[PDB]
């Protein structure tokens, strides 16, 4: 019985080993919007007689 306790404690220590890490790489990334129209900013000014 006391041997099972000693053997169990050793197995607990051996099981404390770490395997790996996992993380997401998202820094520096931004979403993109879509502009549907082109701004021209033009107006045609014409006289009444058209000259």
């Amino acid at each position: 019985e006391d041997m099972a306790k000693i053997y169990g404690a050793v197995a607990a220590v051996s099981k404390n080993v770490n395997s790996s890490v996992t993380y997401e790489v998202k820094r520096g990334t931004h979403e993109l919007i879509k502009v549907p129209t082109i701004p021209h900013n033009l107006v045609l000014i014409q006289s009444d007689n058209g000259k």
Partner: protein, 50 residues
């Protein structure tokens, strides 16, 4: 005539999980005694908790 062979249950070699799976260690025939991969909340954009 009498039928000897007409087919049957066919064994498939691979089971291809058609869905995204989070990282995991060995389970099944080989069981991994090491700790599971640690999920770290890194590369935050807005600065929280600092």
């Amino acid at each position: 005539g009498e039928i000897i062979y007409d087919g049957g249950l066919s064994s498939k070699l691979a089971d291809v999980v058609d869905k995204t799976t989070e990282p995991h260690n060995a389970d099944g025939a080989v069981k991994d005694g090491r700790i599971a991969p640690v999920k770290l909340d890194l590369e935050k954009q807005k600065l929280d908790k600092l």
